[PDB]
Amino acid sequence: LTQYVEGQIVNRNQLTLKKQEDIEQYVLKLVRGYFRTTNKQGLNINSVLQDHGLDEFDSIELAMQVEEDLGYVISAETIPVLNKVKHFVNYINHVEQFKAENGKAPIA
Amino acid sequence: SRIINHLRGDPVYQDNTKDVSLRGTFLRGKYDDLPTMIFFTEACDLTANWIPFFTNPQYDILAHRNVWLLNPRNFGNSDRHPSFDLQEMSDDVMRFMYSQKISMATLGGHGIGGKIALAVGCYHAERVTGVFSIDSSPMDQRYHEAFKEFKGYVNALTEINFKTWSDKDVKVFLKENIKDPKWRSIFTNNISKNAKTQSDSFNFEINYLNHNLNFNKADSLGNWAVKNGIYTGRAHFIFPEYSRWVHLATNTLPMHKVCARVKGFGHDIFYVQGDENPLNHWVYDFENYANVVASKLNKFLHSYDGVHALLKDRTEIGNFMIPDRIKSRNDSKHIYGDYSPAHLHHNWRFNHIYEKHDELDKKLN
Amino acid sequence: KRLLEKLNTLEVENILKRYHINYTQALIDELVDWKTG
Amino acid sequence: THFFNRRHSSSQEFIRFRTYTEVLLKISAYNDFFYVLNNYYYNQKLILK
Amino acid sequence: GYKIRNKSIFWTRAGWKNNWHPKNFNAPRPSYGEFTMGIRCRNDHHSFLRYVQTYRNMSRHCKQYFLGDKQLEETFILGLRSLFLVPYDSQCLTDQIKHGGERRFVDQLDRDFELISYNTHPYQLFTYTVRNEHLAWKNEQYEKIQKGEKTFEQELLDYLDEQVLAEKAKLRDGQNFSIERMTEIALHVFRKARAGKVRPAQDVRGPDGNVNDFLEQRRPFEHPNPTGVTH
Amino acid sequence: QAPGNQDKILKWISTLSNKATTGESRSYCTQLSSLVSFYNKQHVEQIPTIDFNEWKSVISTQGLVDKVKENYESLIKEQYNTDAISKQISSASSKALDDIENELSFHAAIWLNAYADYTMFLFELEEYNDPNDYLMHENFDFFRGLETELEELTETHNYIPGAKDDVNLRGYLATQFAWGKKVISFYRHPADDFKCAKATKNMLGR
Amino acid sequence: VEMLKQNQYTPMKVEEQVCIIFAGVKGFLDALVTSEVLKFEKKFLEHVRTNHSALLKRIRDSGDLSEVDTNELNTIIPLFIQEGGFKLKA
Amino acid sequence: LQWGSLAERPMVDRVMSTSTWPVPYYQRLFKAYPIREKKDKMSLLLSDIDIDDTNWYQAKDFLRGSFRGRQIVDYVENNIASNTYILIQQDVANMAKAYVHDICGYIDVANKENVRILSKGDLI
Amino acid sequence: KENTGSMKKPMAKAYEHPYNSEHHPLNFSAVKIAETFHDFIGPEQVSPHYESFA
Ligand SMILES: CCCCCCCCCCCCCCCCCC(=O)OC[C@H](COP(=O)([O-])OCC(O)COP(=O)([O-])OC[C@@H](COC(=O)CCCCCCCCCCCCCCCCC)OC(=O)CCCCCCCCCCCCCCCCC)OC(=O)CCCCCCCCCCCCCCCCC
Ligand SMILES: CCCCCCCCCCCCCCCCCC(=O)OC[C@H](COP(=O)([O-])OCC[N+](C)(C)C)OC(=O)CCCCCCCCCCCCCCCCC
C-alpha cells in the first residue's frame, strides 16, 4: 500500500465516495491534475476530453490513476469509452452499484 | 568607411622584380585580434566583386579572419612588371606581409588566383597557415577551352587604340569580340580614365599579359611548372560539379601530386552540385554555389587551417601527442617521447604577447 | 510588340549589381539625386 | 542503415517526429548553455521586453 | 549541399515509396464460404484492446523504477506516446499493410513490454543513466546555492544581461534589438566559456587566454602514452 | 506636435492588419483603426484671440463685456489633467489585455525554446567535422541515443535493416538496380508469419 | 458618371470635389459596386472632414494638390473602401 | 569572476601553425578516441525536429523557475480555452479583440473632463 | 522580485541498475564491440617520418 513520492516512501490512501456530489468533484480534480489537460477551469461535467488536449492514450493514464485512488481493476474493454467527464461519473456509479448488489467487483 | 578600407595608390612600372609593391582592399574583422586572410581575385577581375561574399552576415566570414583582397602585379592597382614568375610574384606578397607587419596569413584564390595563392605556400610554407582554392588546380590549363577564350579575348583587347577610338567604338568592339557576358562586364569596369581625362586605358597591363598568354609557354599563367614544387601545409579545394577549368575526371590528381597533405575527395576536395553553365566559375553570383563555398570556407578556417599536419582537426590541439624522431633534439639528456606540436600566435613576431604573458605567468608563481 | 522586338535586335548601377540586388529605376534616381543634392 | 537513416532521411515536405530518446535528452539531458539561452531569451523579451 | 539525383530512387514494383505492400507473387486472394471447407488463420479482432492494455502495462511497469519523480513520469509519458503514435502519423499507410498492420505493431510492442517487465529495455537503462547525470548537476547547483555561492549558469545570465545594456545603449539610430543580435552575443560568450572549461581563466586574460598553453607539451612522467610507442 | 507624431503609429497598425487573414480578424482590425484615427484626429482651427477692450469701447451693455471677460478667463484656466490619466493607464491596463499578455508570452516561450534548440545544435555542430573520419563508436556518441535505439532493435530481434524507419532511404539506395525492386515492409519482424491455408471443393485451395 | 451625379439643393465645397473626383479618375471606384459609389461619396467626405482635417486646409489655402497630399490621399482611398461596409465585388 | 575581453575570441582560434619541408608522409585516417567521454555536449539528433509537446512542457519547466513565469503558466493552463498547449498564431483575431476592448474602454475620458470643467461655471 | 527567487531541493538519485555497467553493459550492440576492437588493434599507428618504412 506504499509508494515512492519524490524519493520518499509514502503510504497510499484509498477513497470511498458513495455519493454523486463527491464523484463529480473527484473526476474534475483528477482531470485538472493531469499535465496534458488544457483549460482546467473551463472543464465541467459536460466537457469532452478531446476539447482539452486529451486523446485515447490520455484516458488510459486517467483510468490508471482511478485504480490507484479507488483500488478498482478496470478492464481494457471499458477504458476506450471514457471520453467525457460524464462517463467517468457514470462508470464509477455503475461499479459502486455492482458491488452493492452482486457483492463482488465487476469482471476485469 | 571602417569595415571597408582599401589603400589608394598609383601603379608604378618597375624594372626590378623585387621593387614591386602590391595594393588591394582590406576588410576589417568584427573582433579585435584575428589572423589575416589574403585572397587573390581572378586575373583581370575586380576585387570589389568579392566584397559581398566576405561581407555577408549570413556567411559571417569576417567573424573568423581579417581579409586582404590583394591584386597581383600587373593587375588592378598593384605595380607592373613584365615577369609573371610565381616565385617572383610570391616574393611580392612576402614583402607586402612585411610592410604590413603580417607574420603569417591564410591564402585564397579564384581560378588563376588559386595558383598564385598556392605558389606562396610552395615558396613560403613556414609563413602560410593554409590554402583555399576555388575552381582552380595546380595544373597546365593552356589547352583548356575556358583558358583559350580568356587567352583569346586578351589578344583581341590589344587591337583597340583608346587615343583614336571613341567611347562608342569601344562598346561595339567588346560586344562583338567578347561573347561571354561576365568577361565582357569585367573588362568594361577595368577601363579607367586617368586624371585630367587625358585618355582611357585598362587598369591591367594588356601588353605584358598578352605576351605571357600568347607565347603559351611554361611562364604562361595557364601553365603550372614543376619549378613551383610542393605545398606542405593545409589545402582545401572547392570547384563546381560541371566546371570548364577543373574536370573531376583527371584534374583532381594534380592536387595529390602538388599538395602533400591533401587527403582526397570528401576531406580536402569537394565539388558543388550544379548544372552545366559557363558562368558557374563565378560562384559569388549564384547563392547556391556561394552558400556551399562559404560553409566549406568557414569550416577550413575554423577547424583545419593552421593545424599541424599529423593532427586531424583543431580539436586535437593540446590533447593529441605526436611521436618524436630519435636524435632530433640538441639536448643529450632528453628522454624521447610524444609531444603536442607548438602552434604560435598569428602575428607573434610583430607583437610582444609572449613577452607579456611570461610576466603574467611569473606573477602567479 | 512587333516594333519593340524589332528594335531590340552609372556607377550606382554597377555597385548594386555586385550585391546581386534587384534595383528599380526610381531607386537609382534618388541615390543620384541624394549625391548631387 | 540505422546511422544513415536517422541522420539523412528527414525532408522538409514531411514532419519529423521526436522519438523516446530525443524526448529524454531534450528534457533531462540539456547542458548549462541550453538552460542559460532559454532563460536569456525569456528575461529579455518576456520580462524586460 | 548534396541532393539525390536519381529520380527513380523511391520507385518500387508496388508504386512510389511503397513500404506497406511490397509486390510479391503469392498475393492475397479472397475466400468464398460456399466453396471453403476449412481454413487456418491467426488474424483476429483483438488488436485494439491489446493496443490499450499494452500501453497501460508499459506505463505502469516503467513507473516502478521512477521513485515517484513526477517530472520523470510526465516526461516518460511523452516518450511513450511517441512510440504508440508511429502508425497514426507515419507516411507509411499502416491501414494498407500486407496482412494487417494492427496485428503487426501490437505484436511488436509486446516484445518491448516483455523486456520492460524485466527492467532490461535499453530505454529504461538509458532513462536511469540520463536522469542520474541530470540530478547530479542539479544537486551541485543546490549545494552551491545553500552556501550563498553563485552558480555558473547565473553568472552567464548576469553577464549577458549587462552586455545587452551595453550594446543597446549605443543602438540609438535603430531600436530593433532583434533575436538574431541577442543570439550572436550569447554564442560568442559560449565559445569563450566552452574553451574555458578545458583551459580555465587564471588571470585578467580570461578563459583560454594564455599562449604558453599551446607551446610544445609532453605527457607527464606519471601518465605516459599507454596505448602505443612514443618514439 | 502636429507633423510626424503619427508615422510610427501607422506602421504598427499596417503590420497588425497584414497579419490578419480571417474576415473576422479583418473586421476587428478596421474597428481598431477607427479608434486610432479617432484618438489621433488633429484639431487645427486657429483659436482666435478676444479683445474685450475693442468691444468694450465700440458698443456693449454696461457690465456685460466685463462680465464675459472675467467669466471667459476663468474657464480658460481650467485644463485637462494629463498626469492623472497617464498613471492609471500605465498601472493597470485591462482584463482582456491580460488574457493575451499571458497567452502570447507562453506562445513565444514555446517558439523561443525551439529557436534555442536549432541554435544550440548549430553551436555544437561546430565541433563535428568530417563524419567519415570519426570512429564508429565516437560518431554514435555525438548522436547520443542511436546506440539505445540500436540496442532495442537487437534485443527485439528486429535485425532486418530499416524495418522501423518510415523512409528507409538506405534500402532504396541499395535496390536502385535490384531485381524485383522492393524495400522491407514497415515494422516487419523476421519471426512473424501470417501465412494462411484453406481447403475448397477444388484442389490446391482454388 | 455615377460620381458626377448630384441631388437637388446639395452644393459641394470645391476642396471636397477635388478629393472625390480624384478617387474616380485614379480607378479606385472600380472596386466597389456602382450603386455604392454615390453613398461612398458622402461617407468618404465625412470621414475626411473629421480625421483628415489638415489635408483639407492645405488644399483650400494653397489651392494645389502637393505630392505629400497625393500619397496620403492615394493611400487612404483604397484603405477607406476596405474599412467601410461596401460591396467590394466589382 | 574573470571573463576577459568580449571582443577577443578563444586563443585556440588565434593560435596557428605552419608547415615546412620535409613533411611527414602519413595521412591520418581517423580521429583518436582513447577515452569514451563526451560529457556536457548535447546530442546532434536534436537538429530538425518540428514543434511538439516537449516545447511547451520544457517551457513551463523554465518558466516555473521565475516569478513572472509562474503566473503565465498558471493563467495559461487554467484561463485559456485551447484544445492544445502547442499554441500557433495564424491570425490576429484574438489580438485585435483584446485591443479594441481596451483602447475603447478609455473613451469618454476627455468628454468626462469637459463635463467638470464646463459644469463649473456658466459663461453667459 | 526575480532576484529573490530560490531553488528547490531535487531528488538525490534515480534508480541504479545492479546488473548494468559501462564495461559490462547488459544489452548488446556493435558500438561496444567496436570499442573492444579498437582497444585490441590499438589506435592508428601514426608515423612521424618523412618516408615510409618499406
Ligand atoms: C633465426 C633468424 C630468423 C628471424 C630473423 C629476423 C627476421 C624477422 C623478419 C622481420 C622483418 C622486419 C619486420 C618489419 C615489419 C613487417 C615487414 C613489413 O614490410 O612491414 C611494413 C609494411 C608496410 O610498410 P610501411 O611503410 O610501414 O606502411 C606504410 C603504409 O601504411 C602501408 O600501406 P600503404 O598502401 O598506404 O603504402 C604502401 C604499401 C603498399 O603495399 C602494401 O600495403 C602491401 C599490401 C598488403 C595488404 C593487402 C591485403 C592482404 C593482407 C590481408 C591480411 C591477411 C593476414 C591476416 C589474416 C590471417 C590472420 C593471421 O606498402 C608498400 O610500400 C609495399 C609493401 C611492402 C613491400 C612488400 C612486402 C610484402 C610482404 C609483406 C606481407 C607479408 C606477407 C606474408 C609473408 C609471410 C609468409 C608466412 O607493412 C605491411 O604492409 C604489412 C606487414 C605485415 C608483415 C607480416 C610478416 C612479417 C615478417 C616480415 C619478413 C619479411 C617478409 C617475408 C615475406 C617474403 C615474401 C616475399
Ligand atoms: C555467400 C553468402 C550466402 C548468400 C546466400 C544467398 C544470397 C541471396 C541474395 C538475395 C537474392 C535472393 C534471390 C531471391 C529472388 C529475388 C528476385 C525476385 O524476387 O524475383 C522477381 C523477378 C524479377 O522481377 P524484377 O522486376 O524485380 O527484375 C526484372 C529483371 N530484369 C530487369 C532484368 C528483367 O520477377 C519474378 O516475379 C519472378 C518470380 C520467381 C522468383 C524466383 C524466386 C526463387 C527463390 C525463392 C526461394 C528461396 C527460398 C530458399 C529458402 C531455403 C530454406 C532452407
Tab-separated table of C-alpha atoms in Angstrom, chain B residues 20-343:
chain	number	residue	atom	x	y	z
B	20	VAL	CA	57.213	45.585	-56.684
B	21	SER	CA	54.504	46.600	-54.211
B	22	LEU	CA	51.032	45.072	-54.019
B	23	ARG	CA	47.811	47.011	-53.440
B	24	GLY	CA	44.313	45.839	-52.633
B	25	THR	CA	41.298	46.115	-50.377
B	26	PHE	CA	41.353	45.307	-46.659
B	27	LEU	CA	38.218	44.134	-44.838
B	28	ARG	CA	38.434	44.548	-41.073
B	29	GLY	CA	37.096	41.790	-38.852
B	30	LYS	CA	34.415	42.003	-36.197
B	31	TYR	CA	36.797	41.072	-33.368
B	32	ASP	CA	39.943	42.816	-32.178
B	33	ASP	CA	42.711	40.266	-32.836
B	34	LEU	CA	42.158	37.812	-35.689
B	35	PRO	CA	44.544	36.125	-38.128
B	36	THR	CA	44.681	37.594	-41.617
B	37	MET	CA	43.462	36.206	-44.939
B	38	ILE	CA	44.976	37.119	-48.314
B	39	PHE	CA	42.674	36.472	-51.281
B	40	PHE	CA	43.603	36.740	-54.963
B	41	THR	CA	40.866	37.537	-57.465
B	42	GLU	CA	40.608	36.030	-60.933
B	43	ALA	CA	43.009	37.516	-63.465
B	44	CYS	CA	41.813	40.854	-64.854
B	45	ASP	CA	38.869	40.623	-62.434
B	46	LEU	CA	37.800	43.214	-59.886
B	47	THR	CA	38.387	42.788	-56.160
B	48	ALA	CA	35.143	44.626	-55.351
B	49	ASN	CA	33.090	41.746	-56.777
B	50	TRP	CA	34.212	39.558	-53.854
B	51	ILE	CA	33.219	42.114	-51.196
B	52	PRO	CA	29.568	40.966	-50.854
B	53	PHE	CA	30.751	37.384	-50.323
B	54	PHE	CA	33.126	38.272	-47.482
B	55	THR	CA	30.760	40.941	-46.084
B	56	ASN	CA	27.547	38.912	-45.879
B	57	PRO	CA	26.098	38.420	-42.369
B	58	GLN	CA	24.670	35.063	-43.440
B	59	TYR	CA	28.172	33.751	-44.154
B	60	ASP	CA	29.930	35.799	-41.452
B	61	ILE	CA	33.445	35.133	-42.722
B	62	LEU	CA	34.931	38.267	-41.149
B	63	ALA	CA	33.950	36.854	-37.752
B	64	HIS	CA	36.830	34.409	-38.320
B	65	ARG	CA	39.617	36.377	-40.013
B	66	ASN	CA	40.640	39.739	-41.414
B	67	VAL	CA	40.667	39.715	-45.211
B	68	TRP	CA	43.197	41.336	-47.553
B	69	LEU	CA	41.739	41.417	-51.065
B	70	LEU	CA	45.062	41.849	-52.847
B	71	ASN	CA	45.862	42.371	-56.520
B	72	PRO	CA	48.875	40.598	-58.072
B	73	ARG	CA	51.420	42.536	-60.079
B	74	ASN	CA	50.192	43.949	-63.404
B	75	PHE	CA	46.614	43.621	-62.086
B	76	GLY	CA	44.406	46.295	-60.584
B	77	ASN	CA	46.305	48.940	-58.636
B	78	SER	CA	49.443	46.906	-57.906
B	79	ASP	CA	52.778	47.661	-59.539
B	80	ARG	CA	53.616	46.464	-63.043
B	81	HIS	CA	56.399	44.146	-64.196
B	82	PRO	CA	56.590	42.008	-67.355
B	83	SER	CA	57.583	38.840	-65.489
B	84	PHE	CA	54.840	36.587	-64.117
B	85	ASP	CA	57.122	34.036	-62.433
B	86	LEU	CA	55.208	32.628	-59.478
B	87	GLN	CA	58.433	32.740	-57.470
B	88	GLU	CA	58.747	36.474	-58.129
B	89	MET	CA	55.026	37.109	-57.644
B	90	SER	CA	55.222	35.137	-54.391
B	91	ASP	CA	58.055	37.262	-53.000
B	92	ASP	CA	55.913	40.324	-53.723
B	93	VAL	CA	53.360	39.038	-51.216
B	94	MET	CA	56.077	38.364	-48.644
B	95	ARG	CA	57.216	41.984	-48.841
B	96	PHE	CA	53.601	43.140	-48.554
B	97	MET	CA	53.211	40.953	-45.465
B	98	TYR	CA	56.410	42.508	-44.100
B	99	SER	CA	55.437	46.111	-44.845
B	100	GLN	CA	52.043	45.450	-43.240
B	101	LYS	CA	53.663	43.564	-40.325
B	102	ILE	CA	51.985	40.217	-41.033
B	103	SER	CA	53.860	37.188	-39.716
B	104	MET	CA	51.706	34.568	-41.451
B	105	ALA	CA	48.425	34.631	-43.349
B	106	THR	CA	45.723	32.431	-44.824
B	107	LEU	CA	45.882	32.372	-48.620
B	108	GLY	CA	42.987	32.033	-51.035
B	109	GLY	CA	42.347	32.350	-54.733
B	110	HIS	CA	39.802	32.018	-57.510
B	111	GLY	CA	40.838	30.329	-60.737
B	112	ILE	CA	44.304	31.559	-61.655
B	113	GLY	CA	44.226	33.318	-58.293
B	114	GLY	CA	44.220	29.896	-56.666
B	115	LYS	CA	47.513	29.176	-58.413
B	116	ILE	CA	49.014	32.404	-57.056
B	117	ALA	CA	47.868	31.519	-53.532
B	118	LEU	CA	49.342	28.015	-53.704
B	119	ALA	CA	52.645	29.285	-55.102
B	120	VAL	CA	53.208	31.360	-51.968
B	121	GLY	CA	52.702	28.277	-49.814
B	122	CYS	CA	55.081	26.395	-52.100
B	123	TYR	CA	57.807	29.051	-51.866
B	124	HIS	CA	56.975	30.305	-48.342
B	125	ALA	CA	55.358	27.484	-46.364
B	126	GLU	CA	56.642	28.383	-42.893
B	127	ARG	CA	54.553	31.584	-43.101
B	128	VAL	CA	51.336	30.209	-44.665
B	129	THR	CA	48.728	28.534	-42.471
B	130	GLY	CA	46.500	27.153	-45.222
B	131	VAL	CA	45.299	27.451	-48.796
B	132	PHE	CA	41.695	27.549	-50.031
B	133	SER	CA	41.440	27.311	-53.822
B	134	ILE	CA	38.168	27.908	-55.674
B	135	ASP	CA	37.659	26.447	-59.161
B	136	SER	CA	41.388	26.062	-59.734
B	137	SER	CA	44.069	23.390	-59.702
B	138	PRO	CA	47.878	23.384	-59.872
B	139	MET	CA	47.745	22.309	-63.496
B	140	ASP	CA	48.621	23.249	-67.065
B	141	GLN	CA	45.474	24.866	-68.483
B	142	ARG	CA	46.961	26.152	-71.749
B	143	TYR	CA	44.769	23.740	-73.734
B	144	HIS	CA	41.584	24.107	-71.673
B	145	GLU	CA	38.774	25.690	-73.668
B	146	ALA	CA	37.991	28.128	-70.851
B	147	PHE	CA	41.577	29.402	-70.838
B	148	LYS	CA	41.720	29.749	-74.627
B	149	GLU	CA	38.759	32.145	-74.593
B	150	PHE	CA	40.404	34.281	-71.914
B	151	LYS	CA	43.666	33.916	-73.825
B	152	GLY	CA	41.773	34.810	-76.993
B	153	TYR	CA	39.890	37.783	-75.550
B	154	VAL	CA	43.046	39.380	-74.139
B	155	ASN	CA	44.547	39.240	-77.629
B	156	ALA	CA	41.508	40.977	-79.128
B	157	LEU	CA	41.766	43.727	-76.496
B	158	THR	CA	45.190	44.646	-77.914
B	159	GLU	CA	43.602	45.857	-81.167
B	160	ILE	CA	41.712	48.770	-79.585
B	161	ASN	CA	43.531	52.118	-79.503
B	162	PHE	CA	41.940	54.413	-76.926
B	163	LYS	CA	43.578	57.538	-78.368
B	164	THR	CA	41.776	57.221	-81.710
B	165	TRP	CA	38.811	55.026	-80.760
B	166	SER	CA	35.726	56.723	-79.333
B	167	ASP	CA	33.652	55.532	-76.387
B	168	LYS	CA	31.025	54.066	-78.723
B	169	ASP	CA	33.680	52.356	-80.849
B	170	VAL	CA	34.770	50.515	-77.697
B	171	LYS	CA	31.326	49.282	-76.650
B	172	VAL	CA	30.732	47.907	-80.147
B	173	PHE	CA	34.149	46.236	-80.098
B	174	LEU	CA	33.514	44.395	-76.829
B	175	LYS	CA	30.059	43.029	-77.659
B	176	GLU	CA	31.230	41.579	-80.977
B	177	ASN	CA	34.684	40.392	-79.900
B	178	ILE	CA	33.660	39.309	-76.380
B	179	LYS	CA	30.773	36.840	-76.282
B	180	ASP	CA	30.985	35.865	-72.618
B	181	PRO	CA	28.798	38.285	-70.612
B	182	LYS	CA	30.858	38.127	-67.418
B	183	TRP	CA	34.266	38.593	-69.050
B	184	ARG	CA	32.757	41.473	-71.035
B	185	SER	CA	31.464	43.177	-67.888
B	186	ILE	CA	34.760	42.576	-66.083
B	187	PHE	CA	36.777	44.212	-68.865
B	188	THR	CA	34.441	47.204	-69.185
B	189	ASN	CA	34.775	48.023	-65.486
B	190	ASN	CA	38.557	47.588	-65.754
B	191	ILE	CA	38.677	50.566	-68.137
B	192	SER	CA	39.569	53.774	-66.307
B	193	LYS	CA	40.171	57.404	-67.258
B	194	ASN	CA	43.336	58.919	-65.820
B	195	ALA	CA	43.353	62.333	-64.173
B	196	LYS	CA	42.625	65.284	-66.474
B	197	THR	CA	40.770	62.884	-68.817
B	198	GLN	CA	43.968	62.581	-70.858
B	199	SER	CA	42.797	59.194	-72.169
B	200	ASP	CA	41.208	55.907	-71.132
B	201	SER	CA	43.190	52.731	-70.507
B	202	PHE	CA	42.879	49.332	-68.861
B	203	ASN	CA	43.734	49.006	-65.181
B	204	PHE	CA	45.703	45.846	-66.021
B	205	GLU	CA	48.786	45.781	-68.248
B	206	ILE	CA	47.352	44.480	-71.516
B	207	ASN	CA	50.753	44.279	-73.243
B	208	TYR	CA	52.648	42.305	-70.596
B	209	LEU	CA	49.676	39.981	-70.119
B	210	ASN	CA	49.118	39.119	-73.783
B	211	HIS	CA	52.779	38.186	-74.211
B	212	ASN	CA	52.527	35.784	-71.269
B	213	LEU	CA	49.394	34.139	-72.680
B	214	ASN	CA	50.050	34.430	-76.418
B	215	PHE	CA	53.525	32.923	-76.076
B	216	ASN	CA	51.815	29.963	-74.373
B	217	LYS	CA	54.964	28.554	-72.754
B	218	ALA	CA	55.972	27.470	-69.262
B	219	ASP	CA	55.818	31.030	-67.936
B	220	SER	CA	52.230	31.280	-69.189
B	221	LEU	CA	49.636	31.725	-66.468
B	222	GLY	CA	47.729	28.698	-67.746
B	223	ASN	CA	50.821	26.581	-67.105
B	224	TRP	CA	51.893	25.134	-63.760
B	225	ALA	CA	55.610	24.382	-63.756
B	226	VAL	CA	57.444	21.684	-61.830
B	227	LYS	CA	59.662	24.508	-60.553
B	228	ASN	CA	56.871	25.603	-58.214
B	229	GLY	CA	57.447	22.498	-56.096
B	230	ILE	CA	55.181	21.135	-53.358
B	231	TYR	CA	52.915	22.766	-50.787
B	232	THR	CA	53.474	21.312	-47.319
B	233	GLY	CA	50.528	22.836	-45.442
B	234	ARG	CA	46.758	22.654	-45.262
B	235	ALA	CA	44.935	22.873	-48.591
B	236	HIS	CA	41.232	22.686	-49.449
B	237	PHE	CA	39.832	22.684	-52.987
B	238	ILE	CA	36.249	23.553	-53.947
B	239	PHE	CA	35.021	23.643	-57.544
B	240	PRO	CA	31.702	23.243	-59.382
B	241	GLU	CA	30.481	19.820	-60.436
B	242	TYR	CA	30.496	20.900	-64.099
B	243	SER	CA	33.443	23.292	-64.383
B	244	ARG	CA	35.357	24.135	-67.547
B	245	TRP	CA	38.532	24.814	-65.544
B	246	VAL	CA	38.745	21.744	-63.276
B	247	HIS	CA	37.396	18.459	-64.643
B	248	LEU	CA	36.570	15.932	-61.933
B	249	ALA	CA	37.841	13.025	-64.056
B	250	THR	CA	41.588	13.743	-64.007
B	251	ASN	CA	42.133	17.332	-62.852
B	252	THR	CA	41.989	16.226	-59.205
B	253	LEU	CA	45.212	14.204	-59.380
B	254	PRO	CA	47.423	17.340	-59.572
B	255	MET	CA	46.151	18.208	-56.096
B	256	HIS	CA	47.603	14.995	-54.693
B	257	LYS	CA	50.624	15.485	-56.957
B	258	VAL	CA	51.355	19.015	-55.725
B	259	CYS	CA	49.899	19.114	-52.186
B	260	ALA	CA	51.461	16.605	-49.814
B	261	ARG	CA	48.819	16.807	-47.068
B	262	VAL	CA	45.737	16.567	-49.318
B	263	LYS	CA	43.803	13.538	-48.081
B	264	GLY	CA	41.424	13.265	-51.030
B	265	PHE	CA	37.852	13.662	-52.189
B	266	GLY	CA	35.365	14.324	-49.407
B	267	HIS	CA	38.000	15.581	-46.943
B	268	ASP	CA	40.016	18.296	-48.713
B	269	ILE	CA	38.470	18.197	-52.217
B	270	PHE	CA	34.790	18.919	-52.850
B	271	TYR	CA	32.543	19.582	-55.828
B	272	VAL	CA	29.472	21.827	-55.701
B	273	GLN	CA	26.268	20.292	-57.023
B	274	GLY	CA	25.254	22.309	-60.063
B	275	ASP	CA	24.200	22.289	-63.682
B	276	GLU	CA	26.300	22.820	-66.798
B	277	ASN	CA	26.668	26.591	-67.105
B	278	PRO	CA	29.764	28.500	-68.287
B	279	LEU	CA	29.037	31.127	-65.611
B	280	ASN	CA	29.462	28.676	-62.721
B	281	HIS	CA	33.093	29.823	-62.497
B	282	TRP	CA	31.789	32.935	-60.699
B	283	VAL	CA	30.343	31.269	-57.613
B	284	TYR	CA	29.781	34.548	-55.761
B	285	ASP	CA	26.978	35.450	-58.186
B	286	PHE	CA	24.851	32.342	-57.544
B	287	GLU	CA	23.665	31.895	-53.960
B	288	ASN	CA	23.640	28.097	-54.208
B	289	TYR	CA	27.318	27.899	-55.156
B	290	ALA	CA	28.346	30.598	-52.680
B	291	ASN	CA	26.489	29.143	-49.690
B	292	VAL	CA	28.440	25.895	-50.040
B	293	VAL	CA	31.783	27.631	-50.595
B	294	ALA	CA	31.217	29.809	-47.528
B	295	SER	CA	30.278	26.887	-45.286
B	296	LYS	CA	33.287	24.937	-46.547
B	297	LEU	CA	35.434	28.064	-46.230
B	298	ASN	CA	34.318	28.742	-42.658
B	299	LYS	CA	34.979	25.089	-41.840
B	300	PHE	CA	38.518	25.251	-43.248
B	301	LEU	CA	39.323	28.441	-41.336
B	302	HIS	CA	37.778	27.231	-38.073
B	303	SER	CA	38.945	23.611	-37.790
B	304	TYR	CA	41.555	22.799	-40.463
B	305	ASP	CA	43.530	25.928	-41.354
B	306	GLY	CA	46.724	26.451	-39.388
B	307	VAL	CA	46.599	22.980	-37.807
B	308	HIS	CA	49.618	20.688	-37.603
B	309	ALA	CA	49.752	18.035	-40.309
B	310	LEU	CA	49.520	14.940	-38.109
B	311	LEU	CA	46.570	16.378	-36.167
B	312	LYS	CA	43.105	15.700	-37.548
B	313	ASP	CA	41.406	18.960	-36.582
B	314	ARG	CA	41.837	21.965	-34.322
B	315	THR	CA	40.033	19.972	-31.611
B	316	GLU	CA	43.160	17.817	-31.213
B	317	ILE	CA	45.332	20.807	-30.249
B	318	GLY	CA	46.528	20.146	-26.705
B	319	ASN	CA	45.179	16.585	-26.396
B	320	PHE	CA	46.913	14.598	-29.181
B	321	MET	CA	50.638	13.913	-28.832
B	322	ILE	CA	52.813	13.372	-31.911
B	323	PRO	CA	55.672	10.830	-31.892
B	324	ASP	CA	59.216	12.193	-31.927
B	325	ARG	CA	62.116	11.033	-34.076
B	326	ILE	CA	65.147	9.805	-32.156
B	327	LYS	CA	68.222	12.060	-32.109
B	328	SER	CA	66.223	15.074	-33.297
B	329	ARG	CA	66.987	17.412	-30.369
B	330	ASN	CA	70.255	19.014	-29.309
B	331	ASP	CA	69.847	18.117	-25.633
B	332	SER	CA	71.627	14.821	-24.997
B	333	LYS	CA	69.906	14.038	-21.672
B	334	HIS	CA	66.457	14.048	-23.294
B	335	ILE	CA	64.028	11.151	-22.886
B	336	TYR	CA	62.408	10.949	-26.306
B	337	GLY	CA	58.634	10.740	-26.211
B	338	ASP	CA	55.426	12.001	-27.735
B	339	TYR	CA	54.711	15.725	-27.772
B	340	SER	CA	51.990	18.130	-28.837
B	341	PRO	CA	53.451	20.387	-31.551
B	342	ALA	CA	53.700	24.108	-30.920
B	343	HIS	CA	51.076	26.358	-32.505
